[PDB]
Amino acid sequence: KTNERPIIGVLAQDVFDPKPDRNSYIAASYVKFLESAGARVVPVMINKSEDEYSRLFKSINGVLFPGGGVSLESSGYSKAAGIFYRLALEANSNGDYFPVWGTCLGFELLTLLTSGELLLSHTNTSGIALPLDFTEDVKGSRLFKEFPEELMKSLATEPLTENSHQWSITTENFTANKKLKKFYRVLSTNTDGYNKFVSTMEAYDFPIYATQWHPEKNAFEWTRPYIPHTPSAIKTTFYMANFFVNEARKNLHSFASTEEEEKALIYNYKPEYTGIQSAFEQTYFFN
Amino acid sequence: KTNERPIIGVLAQDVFDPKPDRNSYIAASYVKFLESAGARVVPVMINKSEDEYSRLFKSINGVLFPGGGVSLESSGYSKAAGIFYRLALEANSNGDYFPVWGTCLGFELLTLLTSGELLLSHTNTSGIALPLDFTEDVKGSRLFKEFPEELMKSLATEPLTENSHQWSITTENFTANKKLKKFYRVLSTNTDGYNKFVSTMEAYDFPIYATQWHPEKNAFEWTRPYIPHTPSAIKTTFYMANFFVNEARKNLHSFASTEEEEKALIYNYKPEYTGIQSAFEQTYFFN
Amino acid sequence: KTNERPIIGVLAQDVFDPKPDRNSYIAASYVKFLESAGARVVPVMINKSEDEYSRLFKSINGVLFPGGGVSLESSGYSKAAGIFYRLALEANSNGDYFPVWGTCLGFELLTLLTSGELLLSHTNTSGIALPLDFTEDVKGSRLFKEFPEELMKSLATEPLTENSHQWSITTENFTANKKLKKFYRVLSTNTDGYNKFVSTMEAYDFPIYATQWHPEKNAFEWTRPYIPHTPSAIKTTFYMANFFVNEARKNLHSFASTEEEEKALIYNYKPEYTGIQSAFEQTYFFN
Amino acid sequence: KTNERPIIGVLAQDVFDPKPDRNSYIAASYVKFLESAGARVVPVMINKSEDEYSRLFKSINGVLFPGGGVSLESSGYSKAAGIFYRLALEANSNGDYFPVWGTCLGFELLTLLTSGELLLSHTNTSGIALPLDFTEDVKGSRLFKEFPEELMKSLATEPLTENSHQWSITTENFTANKKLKKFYRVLSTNTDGYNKFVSTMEAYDFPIYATQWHPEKNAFEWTRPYIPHTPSAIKTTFYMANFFVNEARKNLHSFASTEEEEKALIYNYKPEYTGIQSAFEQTYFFN
Amino acid sequence: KTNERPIIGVLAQDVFDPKPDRNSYIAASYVKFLESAGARVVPVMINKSEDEYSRLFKSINGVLFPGGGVSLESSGYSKAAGIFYRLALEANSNGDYFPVWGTCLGFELLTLLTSGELLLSHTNTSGIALPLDFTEDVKGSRLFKEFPEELMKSLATEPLTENSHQWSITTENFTANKKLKKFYRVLSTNTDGYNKFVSTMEAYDFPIYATQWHPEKNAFEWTRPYIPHTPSAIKTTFYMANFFVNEARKNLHSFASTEEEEKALIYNYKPEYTGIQSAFEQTYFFN
Amino acid sequence: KTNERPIIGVLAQDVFDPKPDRNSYIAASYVKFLESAGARVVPVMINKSEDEYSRLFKSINGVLFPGGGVSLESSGYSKAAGIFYRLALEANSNGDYFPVWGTCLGFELLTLLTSGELLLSHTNTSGIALPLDFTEDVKGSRLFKEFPEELMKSLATEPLTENSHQWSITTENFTANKKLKKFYRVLSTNTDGYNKFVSTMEAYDFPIYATQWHPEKNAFEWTRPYIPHTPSAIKTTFYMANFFVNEARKNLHSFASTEEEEKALIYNYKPEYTGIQSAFEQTYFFN
């Protein structure tokens, strides 16, 4: 019994010096990530009412909190991400299956929403491709259950994952925190040469996945030199999103009416070519 | 010796009532098809000069000829497709590996370009999802070499391939044509219950590939009920693109300057929201 | 003993926009179909009582359930057919040989009436002429016993049978239904390229015969390009009607008043020229 | 090269007490006879200009002169028939293959048209069903070449041919006439016990066919006891028409437009229910 | 030894509407038939005892059974004719030469009496004048021995013999019945174009003669157009009657007294003029 | 051109002792004589105006004047026969062919009518059968032209002609009269022993025939021992009547309506059985 028309919320985030028509943004590569695995996409605006997110939550089939650079405590992004997290946790234990994806900044907020503590520390990972260093919990995991055995060996040995974060959470800072330990299964770690930090994780009891690294960049962003683009980096982006969309198909929510749908979809927006100098080749800007 | 930053051209084609800023178009799903496998895309304009096309040809790493409804003999599309075909044979013959993909109309165009003759018959395939009746020659094929065995079985038995064409070449007419028969290995057939036609083929001595069906739709088009959207149909569209792009990574062509490259890319254009009424969610219109 | 003045009822069917003198209709080609094999025809009105249909049933020699688009459960067509079907079983079981013929929508009602369930799937068969794929069971069959050999060869390989149905029963669903499996001998199947469905059948124990296709159109309908008209397509319409009318020659009912016979006969109605627009050259409408 | 949309003209004949809208008539059994063999019908009106008969002649694929009881010398029927006869002889000798069929009155008119004389004698043949007494010349013959052998045997021995004429041409008067004997191959005779008379004939060098009996009655007329209705009578009517209409599929005339076609067809007219009184169930009356 | 004053009984038959003085009738043409060949006539009454019949038989020189339409199995006519039939067989086997003549109904009754079965079929022979189709067996037959040759040739070719019967015995049924084959020499046959039947016979070993046709009508009945009246038809009636009376001359019976002879003779009755309505100019009616 | 329904007048004759309904008479044997040769008979009444005879004359096709014993000069018989004789002479000279037959008394009238004188004398001929003494002129003759040559030899050698007359014209008396001798060819003579008399004649220039004997009696009259009854005598009465009626077939008069035809015929009358007493079995008596 399945939803073969999934639609996924992707969270917008506060623009640095915000102006009308430029209050928040989404890099296009997050939209491509999901569409390529057979989902459609709805942007989730910054600074809306609790009721408004609650309407949309009940309409859409999952949410993704993208990476980026805004505050985890006082941004529109952080507030909205917080409502979805809470709504998502509520729906799942009611047996309404609703998955959540955290990427970089999104992963970092998930550690803050779950523990209630800002546990992040600097790492030299602002711009570098890395393999993954898997833990022993990987064999049992949901996230990587359908990855070809050969992609998994490639993951562990080749620099297939984009890192472009100044903050990470450390293996020790993670194990120490009671709340995180008992909530999230760690699936991979990484080192920056001095610090060993958590790189991919999934919740024991909820469809919540997070990567400190950017699975969306390998196939879709080309403006920096630390973005891997080898065939097996391309496959990695597909299989990561393929698993996530496959999670959203377990969700049966749907828009009230289909004209409502048409008006919510990312196809109403046109992104600009931000590639000549930004890290994003294209970005969507929202009032 | 590979090119891990491939750029693929996609042929625009003639709009029916050609007003300016609207003389040709590309269904965005063809762009998504290719980006998602880790290429970038350049739209190939509709009514340019042999010199202009060979300059684009010399900068790019492959071409795709999309489906559509435009004349196979007298359209801007048809003429420019001919030029690109001519140049690809020549390049390939000189050790310069350049791949060609044709979908639906492109595939139809390829039968004409290589046989020299218009060999198409009516078929009742305007909006049906079909499995592929593989031939014996799939066993050694280039195109399907990397497909997982599971997905090959799914393709033989499930309605994973979308058919939205009025014309096909029957297998009878393909076989009797000595030029097609010598040039192309047939990988699959299909039928409409009376006419048996060629559905997927690859060139024996050249990286030319072609499907009567539309691999790009499964992941990216949602407005028509004969577009398959199951997990296996989603894999299908990735694995089809993944093969084509891996072929383009064997090409070494590049742009004269990365200024000029920047001005060629599809990112320079905004597609229009066409999904309310049309078979495409998004279409790029060009002057 | 035989009846050489057989009279066969044809069932009228509900008009999409019912007015007076226009509540129901019979496409003229059904009447021509039976007349040409040497029967007379009585149209069977739609919204009548169980009781009036027995009086009509006792006077006639056969019934036929035409194709069309009306409801299989809630229509007056569906109710009246149900009554005739039951009347027919009782009668045959008591040594009163009474044959029933179903075409397109009538073949479909026959599956529902004998199985007790709706087992139909969408097929892409709205406007194509097909050969018949004969089962191994044609060799014994009643329906095809007097077809000339060459005609049977022609029918196996030439597009001689008109298909214009949105629904079918797949051979899967047929075979999984014990009641259908035990009741109907399958004489031919067809495909639309994915779905394989039953296209001709006869009951093992009852003079009940059904085609998913329209044998009546080849000789008598001219306004769509998927109706075949080669000489063997014409013989096909004659040999099909001839079999069924020779079945009716086995029933010894008669009208008790030669005066009411005179007033029930199709000759009291005049059909209108619907051919400029309709798939039907002529159509009888009834109050 | 063949015409699979044949259209055959049927001549109307003068009504005995002519009134507005009841000037001429066609018995509907002649319409049905031709439709059942896969032709469409055009009623040819009786008192029209020579340019109009020429326009109709050049549009249709054959002509039939029906039975009845109007004058062979001075009726609108006879003048129009003589025009069509002369058009057909000219067209056929010019390589434009055009068949002509004469039934009862039309057969008698053919003897007069081709001999230039009235050579008829009274015979006791109003009302009776007769076998055919085939001549030696049946063996080579065109008319009967596709009849099953067993139907030929039934024809030779069972009362399958409806006779309802007061006049015949005797075999003696036929052979004595130099023109008849040279023009027409005799296929069958019959006898009323005293007069032996020509019953079936075909022109040696022209596609001109003629029966003294009424092949169209068996399947379609039910109001007189001397109309045969056995299974093999019904096949007689089919095979007779089938042969003639296959003659018309050799003629490649077409109407000037599909609109002119539409306007000429018998579907513009509605027959009267005439069967309680007359030997015809239905009859088309024309102004 | 010869009887030159022959007296022949003609059997009366039941009126369809029995009333006093009108229970049986003889058409006068049968009396005139006999008289004109030089016989006198006694009407033979219908509802009499075996004894009354025996006494009459012994007195007369011959008997004739006329045509008409009463029952062959259950009328006064049929029972009386049976008696005479057995009496004549008995007399003739004992050298008492006694002729019997059966016309129409009489001819049919003879087939029943001698075969013991009802073997008759409908033929289209109620109103027509026919030649005789003589068998080889006429060659030395008794009936025609004294016919002039010129007359025999006219009878073979000209319509000299009056047919007005609904029933006949076919050639096939005559020759299949052993008793009839043994007993009757077939002199002529006739056909209505389908049924071939026996038209004149004579007993091999008995002076029993029969015609299915009516030789007495030609000279004496003027009420119908199918009675021949040419000169050789008049000759036919005379020679037919001449032969039968020359047979009766070989019989030597006489009446006991000449008063009884006088009371027996047709002369005691006066016929009625029935020519305005019926087929008979004059009919004798008896109580 | 002939008349094959001929109607012949027979003149009635004065009764001896006249009563009401008994003023005139005709022996039925003259009626049977003519019917037996295929004519109908009109009795011609005795005492009627010239205009009634002219009407009747113009209606009928011939006239017979019978034998008997009434005045040749002053009876109604004789006056009416004179009228008929004169009209018949006038019609014949104007090409209206009208034959007249005289028997015995009528023969004698004719000698009187054509000579203008009474030239009869006694002969011993009141009751004897005689052969004919043919003249050399019978070879020329019209009367006997169609008699079989064996009948001619019989008539000349056997007592075939009944004589029942008291008067004759001797041959001497015939030949002496210049009028008779130019008018009539003597066909036969006879002798009574002493007197040689004219017994058969026919006119050279008109169809008038006369016998002094009674051809009618041989087949029809049985009450006198000098009436011959041998098969030849029977044939004699047929061939004599046959010739006369064939003369009447050359005449084309008809009645002015069928109604009047019907009222004139002998069928309106019933004769009396006079056989116990008279030379006449049956006689019609008229008022």
PDB file of C-alpha atoms in Angstrom, chain D residues 44-190:
ATOM      1  CA  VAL D  44     -30.184   6.065 -57.760  1.00  0.00           C
ATOM      2  CA  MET D  45     -33.234   8.346 -58.476  1.00  0.00           C
ATOM      3  CA  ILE D  46     -35.464   7.810 -61.479  1.00  0.00           C
ATOM      4  CA  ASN D  47     -36.047  10.825 -63.613  1.00  0.00           C
ATOM      5  CA  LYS D  48     -32.741  12.674 -63.623  1.00  0.00           C
ATOM      6  CA  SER D  49     -30.545  14.345 -66.208  1.00  0.00           C
ATOM      7  CA  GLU D  50     -27.933  12.412 -68.222  1.00  0.00           C
ATOM      8  CA  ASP D  51     -25.163  14.591 -66.703  1.00  0.00           C
ATOM      9  CA  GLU D  52     -26.384  13.620 -63.244  1.00  0.00           C
ATOM     10  CA  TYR D  53     -26.364   9.891 -64.047  1.00  0.00           C
ATOM     11  CA  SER D  54     -22.855  10.405 -65.460  1.00  0.00           C
ATOM     12  CA  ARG D  55     -21.745  12.151 -62.218  1.00  0.00           C
ATOM     13  CA  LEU D  56     -23.204   9.282 -60.150  1.00  0.00           C
ATOM     14  CA  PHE D  57     -21.725   6.638 -62.431  1.00  0.00           C
ATOM     15  CA  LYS D  58     -18.208   8.177 -62.058  1.00  0.00           C
ATOM     16  CA  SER D  59     -18.644   8.240 -58.269  1.00  0.00           C
ATOM     17  CA  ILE D  60     -19.815   4.692 -57.448  1.00  0.00           C
ATOM     18  CA  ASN D  61     -18.182   1.296 -57.878  1.00  0.00           C
ATOM     19  CA  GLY D  62     -21.054  -0.791 -59.488  1.00  0.00           C
ATOM     20  CA  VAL D  63     -24.821  -0.771 -60.110  1.00  0.00           C
ATOM     21  CA  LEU D  64     -27.690  -3.074 -59.453  1.00  0.00           C
ATOM     22  CA  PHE D  65     -31.018  -3.126 -61.382  1.00  0.00           C
ATOM     23  CA  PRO D  66     -33.585  -4.589 -58.974  1.00  0.00           C
ATOM     24  CA  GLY D  67     -36.660  -6.773 -59.575  1.00  0.00           C
ATOM     25  CA  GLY D  68     -40.239  -5.445 -59.689  1.00  0.00           C
ATOM     26  CA  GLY D  69     -43.026  -4.948 -62.133  1.00  0.00           C
ATOM     27  CA  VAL D  70     -42.640  -1.675 -64.020  1.00  0.00           C
ATOM     28  CA  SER D  71     -42.325  -1.404 -67.804  1.00  0.00           C
ATOM     29  CA  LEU D  72     -39.091  -2.401 -69.547  1.00  0.00           C
ATOM     30  CA  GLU D  73     -39.713   0.080 -72.334  1.00  0.00           C
ATOM     31  CA  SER D  74     -41.148   3.364 -71.074  1.00  0.00           C
ATOM     32  CA  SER D  75     -40.540   3.543 -67.266  1.00  0.00           C
ATOM     33  CA  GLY D  76     -38.170   6.054 -65.564  1.00  0.00           C
ATOM     34  CA  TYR D  77     -36.489   2.808 -64.276  1.00  0.00           C
ATOM     35  CA  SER D  78     -35.836   1.554 -67.782  1.00  0.00           C
ATOM     36  CA  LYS D  79     -34.439   4.829 -69.181  1.00  0.00           C
ATOM     37  CA  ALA D  80     -32.044   5.277 -66.248  1.00  0.00           C
ATOM     38  CA  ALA D  81     -30.896   1.610 -66.428  1.00  0.00           C
ATOM     39  CA  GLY D  82     -30.205   1.953 -70.184  1.00  0.00           C
ATOM     40  CA  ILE D  83     -28.029   4.991 -69.415  1.00  0.00           C
ATOM     41  CA  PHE D  84     -26.063   3.078 -66.705  1.00  0.00           C
ATOM     42  CA  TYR D  85     -25.730   0.043 -69.032  1.00  0.00           C
ATOM     43  CA  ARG D  86     -24.230   2.130 -71.824  1.00  0.00           C
ATOM     44  CA  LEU D  87     -21.892   3.983 -69.316  1.00  0.00           C
ATOM     45  CA  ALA D  88     -20.684   0.603 -67.972  1.00  0.00           C
ATOM     46  CA  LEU D  89     -20.004  -0.924 -71.455  1.00  0.00           C
ATOM     47  CA  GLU D  90     -18.023   2.141 -72.413  1.00  0.00           C
ATOM     48  CA  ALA D  91     -16.088   2.247 -69.121  1.00  0.00           C
ATOM     49  CA  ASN D  92     -15.268  -1.394 -69.153  1.00  0.00           C
ATOM     50  CA  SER D  93     -14.037  -1.275 -72.792  1.00  0.00           C
ATOM     51  CA  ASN D  94     -11.930   1.679 -71.738  1.00  0.00           C
ATOM     52  CA  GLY D  95     -10.220  -0.461 -68.977  1.00  0.00           C
ATOM     53  CA  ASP D  96     -12.310   1.067 -66.121  1.00  0.00           C
ATOM     54  CA  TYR D  97     -13.737  -2.182 -64.596  1.00  0.00           C
ATOM     55  CA  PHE D  98     -17.390  -1.556 -63.651  1.00  0.00           C
ATOM     56  CA  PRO D  99     -19.802  -4.253 -62.600  1.00  0.00           C
ATOM     57  CA  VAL D 100     -23.538  -4.398 -63.239  1.00  0.00           C
ATOM     58  CA  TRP D 101     -26.031  -6.741 -61.560  1.00  0.00           C
ATOM     59  CA  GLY D 102     -29.555  -7.396 -62.903  1.00  0.00           C
ATOM     60  CA  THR D 103     -32.120  -9.152 -60.641  1.00  0.00           C
ATOM     61  CA  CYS D 104     -35.653 -10.346 -62.109  1.00  0.00           C
ATOM     62  CA  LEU D 105     -36.869  -7.261 -63.876  1.00  0.00           C
ATOM     63  CA  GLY D 106     -33.183  -6.215 -64.175  1.00  0.00           C
ATOM     64  CA  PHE D 107     -32.266  -9.535 -65.803  1.00  0.00           C
ATOM     65  CA  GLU D 108     -35.160  -9.111 -68.235  1.00  0.00           C
ATOM     66  CA  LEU D 109     -34.020  -5.532 -68.974  1.00  0.00           C
ATOM     67  CA  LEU D 110     -30.544  -6.815 -69.707  1.00  0.00           C
ATOM     68  CA  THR D 111     -31.935  -9.174 -72.351  1.00  0.00           C
ATOM     69  CA  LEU D 112     -33.660  -6.250 -74.051  1.00  0.00           C
ATOM     70  CA  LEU D 113     -30.742  -3.844 -73.561  1.00  0.00           C
ATOM     71  CA  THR D 114     -28.298  -6.268 -75.155  1.00  0.00           C
ATOM     72  CA  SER D 115     -30.480  -7.869 -77.931  1.00  0.00           C
ATOM     73  CA  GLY D 116     -32.350  -4.694 -78.755  1.00  0.00           C
ATOM     74  CA  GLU D 117     -35.553  -6.856 -78.560  1.00  0.00           C
ATOM     75  CA  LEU D 118     -38.286  -8.025 -76.120  1.00  0.00           C
ATOM     76  CA  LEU D 119     -38.001 -11.798 -76.192  1.00  0.00           C
ATOM     77  CA  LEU D 120     -40.059 -12.750 -73.114  1.00  0.00           C
ATOM     78  CA  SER D 121     -42.767 -15.475 -72.510  1.00  0.00           C
ATOM     79  CA  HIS D 122     -45.151 -16.095 -69.619  1.00  0.00           C
ATOM     80  CA  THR D 123     -44.064 -18.718 -67.081  1.00  0.00           C
ATOM     81  CA  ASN D 124     -45.745 -20.221 -64.047  1.00  0.00           C
ATOM     82  CA  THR D 125     -43.174 -18.705 -61.751  1.00  0.00           C
ATOM     83  CA  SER D 126     -44.778 -16.140 -59.545  1.00  0.00           C
ATOM     84  CA  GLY D 127     -44.170 -17.691 -56.191  1.00  0.00           C
ATOM     85  CA  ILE D 128     -41.898 -20.776 -56.133  1.00  0.00           C
ATOM     86  CA  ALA D 129     -38.501 -21.820 -54.627  1.00  0.00           C
ATOM     87  CA  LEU D 130     -36.319 -23.658 -57.158  1.00  0.00           C
ATOM     88  CA  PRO D 131     -32.902 -25.380 -57.319  1.00  0.00           C
ATOM     89  CA  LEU D 132     -30.660 -24.235 -60.171  1.00  0.00           C
ATOM     90  CA  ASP D 133     -30.230 -26.500 -63.141  1.00  0.00           C
ATOM     91  CA  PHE D 134     -26.615 -25.629 -63.827  1.00  0.00           C
ATOM     92  CA  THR D 135     -25.239 -25.866 -67.380  1.00  0.00           C
ATOM     93  CA  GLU D 136     -21.909 -27.303 -68.484  1.00  0.00           C
ATOM     94  CA  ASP D 137     -20.660 -23.675 -68.696  1.00  0.00           C
ATOM     95  CA  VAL D 138     -20.809 -23.261 -64.882  1.00  0.00           C
ATOM     96  CA  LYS D 139     -17.437 -24.947 -64.673  1.00  0.00           C
ATOM     97  CA  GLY D 140     -15.373 -22.259 -66.177  1.00  0.00           C
ATOM     98  CA  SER D 141     -17.532 -19.545 -64.554  1.00  0.00           C
ATOM     99  CA  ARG D 142     -16.692 -16.328 -62.756  1.00  0.00           C
ATOM    100  CA  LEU D 143     -19.878 -15.878 -60.706  1.00  0.00           C
ATOM    101  CA  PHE D 144     -19.633 -19.187 -58.913  1.00  0.00           C
ATOM    102  CA  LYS D 145     -15.835 -19.552 -58.641  1.00  0.00           C
ATOM    103  CA  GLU D 146     -15.615 -18.857 -54.886  1.00  0.00           C
ATOM    104  CA  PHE D 147     -18.784 -20.757 -53.803  1.00  0.00           C
ATOM    105  CA  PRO D 148     -18.075 -23.684 -51.517  1.00  0.00           C
ATOM    106  CA  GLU D 149     -18.471 -26.961 -53.477  1.00  0.00           C
ATOM    107  CA  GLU D 150     -21.042 -28.224 -51.013  1.00  0.00           C
ATOM    108  CA  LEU D 151     -23.069 -25.031 -51.594  1.00  0.00           C
ATOM    109  CA  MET D 152     -22.946 -25.654 -55.327  1.00  0.00           C
ATOM    110  CA  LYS D 153     -24.284 -29.176 -54.663  1.00  0.00           C
ATOM    111  CA  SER D 154     -27.103 -27.852 -52.408  1.00  0.00           C
ATOM    112  CA  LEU D 155     -27.876 -25.240 -55.074  1.00  0.00           C
ATOM    113  CA  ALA D 156     -28.215 -28.015 -57.726  1.00  0.00           C
ATOM    114  CA  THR D 157     -30.585 -30.014 -55.631  1.00  0.00           C
ATOM    115  CA  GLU D 158     -32.535 -28.041 -53.039  1.00  0.00           C
ATOM    116  CA  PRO D 159     -35.220 -25.263 -53.466  1.00  0.00           C
ATOM    117  CA  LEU D 160     -32.896 -22.340 -52.587  1.00  0.00           C
ATOM    118  CA  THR D 161     -33.787 -19.756 -55.243  1.00  0.00           C
ATOM    119  CA  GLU D 162     -36.757 -17.529 -54.945  1.00  0.00           C
ATOM    120  CA  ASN D 163     -38.771 -17.152 -58.164  1.00  0.00           C
ATOM    121  CA  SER D 164     -41.490 -14.486 -58.318  1.00  0.00           C
ATOM    122  CA  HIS D 165     -41.672 -13.398 -61.959  1.00  0.00           C
ATOM    123  CA  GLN D 166     -44.452 -13.687 -64.663  1.00  0.00           C
ATOM    124  CA  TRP D 167     -41.927 -13.482 -67.454  1.00  0.00           C
ATOM    125  CA  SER D 168     -38.817 -15.397 -68.486  1.00  0.00           C
ATOM    126  CA  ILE D 169     -36.715 -15.698 -71.646  1.00  0.00           C
ATOM    127  CA  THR D 170     -36.819 -19.368 -72.888  1.00  0.00           C
ATOM    128  CA  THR D 171     -33.524 -21.131 -73.589  1.00  0.00           C
ATOM    129  CA  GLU D 172     -34.803 -21.581 -77.123  1.00  0.00           C
ATOM    130  CA  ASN D 173     -35.505 -17.830 -77.643  1.00  0.00           C
ATOM    131  CA  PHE D 174     -32.182 -17.013 -75.995  1.00  0.00           C
ATOM    132  CA  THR D 175     -30.018 -19.292 -78.218  1.00  0.00           C
ATOM    133  CA  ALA D 176     -31.934 -18.172 -81.324  1.00  0.00           C
ATOM    134  CA  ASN D 177     -30.910 -14.611 -80.581  1.00  0.00           C
ATOM    135  CA  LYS D 178     -27.509 -14.005 -82.062  1.00  0.00           C
ATOM    136  CA  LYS D 179     -26.697 -11.080 -79.819  1.00  0.00           C
ATOM    137  CA  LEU D 180     -27.692 -12.831 -76.554  1.00  0.00           C
ATOM    138  CA  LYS D 181     -25.928 -16.076 -77.430  1.00  0.00           C
ATOM    139  CA  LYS D 182     -22.682 -14.292 -78.169  1.00  0.00           C
ATOM    140  CA  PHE D 183     -22.819 -11.833 -75.288  1.00  0.00           C
ATOM    141  CA  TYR D 184     -23.992 -13.963 -72.367  1.00  0.00           C
ATOM    142  CA  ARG D 185     -22.713 -17.252 -70.973  1.00  0.00           C
ATOM    143  CA  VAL D 186     -25.623 -19.180 -69.516  1.00  0.00           C
ATOM    144  CA  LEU D 187     -24.919 -20.645 -66.083  1.00  0.00           C
ATOM    145  CA  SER D 188     -28.294 -22.092 -65.133  1.00  0.00           C
ATOM    146  CA  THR D 189     -31.679 -22.919 -66.526  1.00  0.00           C
ATOM    147  CA  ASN D 190     -34.982 -23.776 -64.817  1.00  0.00           C
TER     148      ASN D 190
END
